[PDB]
Amino acid sequence: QFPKLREWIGQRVIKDMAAQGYQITNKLFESTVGVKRTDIEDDNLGVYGPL
């Protein structure tokens, strides 16, 4: 942004804006588990399949 009002219109002093930047990497996140194909079918109680 712009700085304070100075105290001299005689011999005015120029200024510049500062360009700021922020860099961030969006790396992935994961998590998983292994299960057997027969066991999910060989489970009549409803558990092992709410996975």
Partner 1 sequence: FAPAADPGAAWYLLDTSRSLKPLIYQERMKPSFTSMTKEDDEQV
Partner 2 sequence: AIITPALISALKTSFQKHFQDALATAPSTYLQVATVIPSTTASNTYGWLG
Partner 3 sequence: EVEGVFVRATVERRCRAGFCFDKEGQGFADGVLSDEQLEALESDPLLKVERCTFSG
Q: Which residues bind partner 3 (CB under 8 A)?
A: 11-16, 18
Residue 17 or 28 having the CB closest to partner 2: 17
Residue 26 or 44 having the CB closest to partner 1: 26
Token pair listed for 49: 């399949």
Site string for partner 1, 10-49 (x = CB under 8 A): --------------x-x-x-x-xxxxxxx-x---------
Burial of 13 (0-12, 13-18, 19+ CB in 10 A): exposed
**CA quadruple 37, 42, 46, 51: dihedral, nearest 10:** -20
